[PDB]
Amino acid sequence: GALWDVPLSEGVYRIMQRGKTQVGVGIHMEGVFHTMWHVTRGSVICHETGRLEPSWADVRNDMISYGGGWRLGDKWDKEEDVQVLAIEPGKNPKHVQTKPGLFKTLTGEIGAVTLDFKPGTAGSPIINKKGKVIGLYGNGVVTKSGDYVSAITQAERDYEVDEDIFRKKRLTIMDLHPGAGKTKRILPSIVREALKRRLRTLILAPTRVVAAEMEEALRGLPIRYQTPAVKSEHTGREIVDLMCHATFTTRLLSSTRVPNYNLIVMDEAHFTDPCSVAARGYISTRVEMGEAAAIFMTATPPGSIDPFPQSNSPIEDIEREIPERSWNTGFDWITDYQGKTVWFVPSIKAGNDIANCLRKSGKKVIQLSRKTFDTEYPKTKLTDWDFVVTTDISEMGANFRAGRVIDPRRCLKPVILTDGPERVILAGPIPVTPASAAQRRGRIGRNPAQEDDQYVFSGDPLKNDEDHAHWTEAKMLLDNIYTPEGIIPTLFGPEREKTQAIDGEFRLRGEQRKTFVELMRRGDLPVWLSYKVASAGISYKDREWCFTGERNNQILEENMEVEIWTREGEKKKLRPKWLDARVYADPMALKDFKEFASGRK
């Protein structure tokens, strides 16, 4: 069959519709609502106890689940009488016993009953002698006599993985598109047999929320979440370690007890974050060492170019003009549409402008950024909204129940300039990558219910991220990760030609490497800036370099020359020796960096 995609009682029920009409019948067994597909077609099941959403759907057999798979295995045996628990509209339930005839299909045969009940009895349970549901009444056919005969429709019931994906010195890239049951079917199976092979398994999620979803999907299995507040943690028991990409890279930078995971699975392995790229480099090195097997799961593997990949649910690709800033008129199609929309913005600032503009017209808007993601994403489901205005961070496993995505296909790109004084600027808004466009578009076309999801976009993608700072920064991280003799940890193959930086040119001394790590993970500074400060021999507490810079390194906030009161109590102009645009890109980053410059961080 097929799975579904979305972020207590007892007995059979009348499926009622507003417009109190009865449209069908269902059975709550084992903690799952059983019903027929033509009755609801994936519509939400609203009730006092809450809401039920699709999970298993076999359209070819006209069956659908609510709240899990189907625990309905009892089937007719071609020689036994059954009852139909007919629940008709506006009438008490009836028990009609009839020894079933046969529906000899083309391929091949299934039991059927010659009972004709009122419209709305679809989903009425067919009952066993033991008192078990043996099928569903509601889907049948009329004969030449004009008589109605319904069939006893019944379900039958994961994913069987190849054995060589566990084979050492092997890196497998799984191309999985939204709606593949990746998190809920594939990964749990992979882990399940990984344990049968007694493998030391490491699972990497891009963000905390994705890892949380994994925990949801991996319940019942021995999984331990690893936090970046711990360098290493070894238990004698068999177990699978679940952590974030950044946590893994951090532990590689600061620990000595990093265990030899012989099976490493990375989800959303397209994440262009420096820590993620470095992680892919290290993992690839371990595989090359013949010490581990690796699995990279992503909808956009290396070489991906198609911005319009086929989805499991239909997507309407619409090309039209999209506002770059706040607007007053000429864009009614944005606000008149009230499904839920996910709008990708090139930056936090543009996001603020758009979000405010939408809110001023009565639209509930949730904003998402890199630093607010793990806090603000969870309220995109526990609350209801109209627009999610997000940056590129939503291109990593972020799942929304939306119908439309607005994607002007623009973004910012950190670049390391070498026009004399080495600097980092934010170039943009520039066109996104084809992969990014595909991932932004991938937020929809996931729900088999809605057949009219809309991807509204503008402009074309561009494969011009060679000068992206993240490749260099990843090399900075990876250079400070110890490896055996002869084995040198370089970037992941398909991502290494992107950078022109050579190997090992960023390896730091013992204590300076520690300063580097602390500047990143405690100072919350970019990799480039942290490397620049740490390589200069500067300690973590020394903040004098924040004011030593040349004139043009003067930081501005709201067209003001930013001024900071130091911890000693001295008033200095914020003028860093090394200039990274990302520390004054948005208000919050500038606030944090100003807290750093004051020595209060």
Binding site: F117, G120, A122, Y137, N139, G140
Partner: protein, 55 residues
């Protein structure tokens, strides 16, 4: 008006109760009928609008 508006309202071989709209070829307007869930003919609309617009 199309040639499927010819057809009488068709409740299929399924046993659900989904109120739909059919174009009456008897009287001259659109009106409700009970749809079974499967095998919908073209003379079957989710609204009175679409029925009136098509015919």
């Amino acid at each position: 008006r199309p040639d499927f508006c010819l057809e009488p309202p068709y409740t299929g071989p399924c046993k659900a109760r989904i109120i739909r709209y059919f174009y009456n070829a008897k009287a001259g307007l659109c009106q409700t009928f009970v749809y079974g869930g499967c095998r919908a003919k073209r003379n079957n609309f989710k609204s009175a609008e679409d029925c009136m617009r098509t015919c």
